[PDB]
Symmetry: C3
Subunit: 32 residues, 3 copies
């Protein structure tokens, strides 16, 4: 159950990091 958790958390971290760069690019273009 835990080794399974570590995998998933690791995948989540990568997805969250990608969302972090898309979101920074968006905020910069949108401004306001």
């Amino acid at each position: 159950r835990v080794a399974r958790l570590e995998k998933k958390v690791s995948a989540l971290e990568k997805k969250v990091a990608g969302l972090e760069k898309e979101v920074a690019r968006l905020k910069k273009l949108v401004g306001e």
Copy 2:
């Protein structure tokens, strides 16, 4: 501990999933 972690991780996966769909829509809009 572990059941707690599994509930949390499931909930994150669905939230990341939702973030990913909103951000794809926003990139398409802002990117025109």
Copy 3:
């Protein structure tokens, strides 16, 4: 290992909440 996981999931939860906040703001600014 479980305690490092718990902190990893805690940090992800915080990050997901902030991204949800920013994406909601951006949606409002971009419109429909």
